[PDB]
């Protein structure tokens with residue numbers, strides 16, 4: 001039931017999503033090993049992801065969290081980069097999309113920094129890079145990120161390096 | 162998938178060394194996220 005609608009570059013919604021993408025790039029402590037060396041992106045397309053069933057699954061759960069947290073979902077817009085982006089947009093997020101080995105346990109991980117999610121597009125640690133050239137810093141091959149609505153509710157704060 | 166810490170719905174990873182890093186977040190239920198935008202892009206070689 002998923003359909004993808006292209007946004008026009010003229011649309012304010014395209015433009016605000018582009019700005020969040022571009023303005024949250026940072027340098028990484030790996031010198032670009034995982035994700036490549038870059039200060040900015042060439043945005044080729046932005047599509048709106050529409051699935052009624054998946055949306056209702058999200059809002060149902062959001063209302064539950066909200067009612068457990070003084071009517072505050074603590075909703076954010078955050079990036080996610082994954083080899084499984086195509087399954088995610090058709091079937092939703094589930095246990096198969098979790099980072100089993102992540103620093104905060106097996107769950108599904110999101111970032112404020114678009115460049116952090118970019119490090120996972122080709123797998124954990126950047127995997128072997130693009131399928132075509134085996135290059136984690138490929139400047140040719142087309143990459144995809146998700147910009148996602150995420151319900152945090154009451155969030156456990158972990159200070160960490 | 163693990164469980165949220167008892168009494169919580171997510172974990173926030175607050176950066177504590179790299180002063181330029183933003184936060185990272187973990188949820189333990191797939192229903193707590195909706196993939197709203199699909200962005201297709203290239204990284205650009207610095208000049």
Ligand SMILES: O=c1cc(-c2ccc(F)cc2)oc2ccccc12
Pocket residue numbers: 079080081082083097098099100109110111116117118120124185186
């Ligand atoms: O966007 C992310 C995807 C993933 C990710 C991890 C393992 C997978 F198998 C798929 C995606 O990990 C992250 C860790 C920190 C911040 C963001 C991410």
Ligand SMILES: [Zn+2]
Pocket residue numbers: 130131132133134135138139140141
């Ligand atoms: Zn390539």
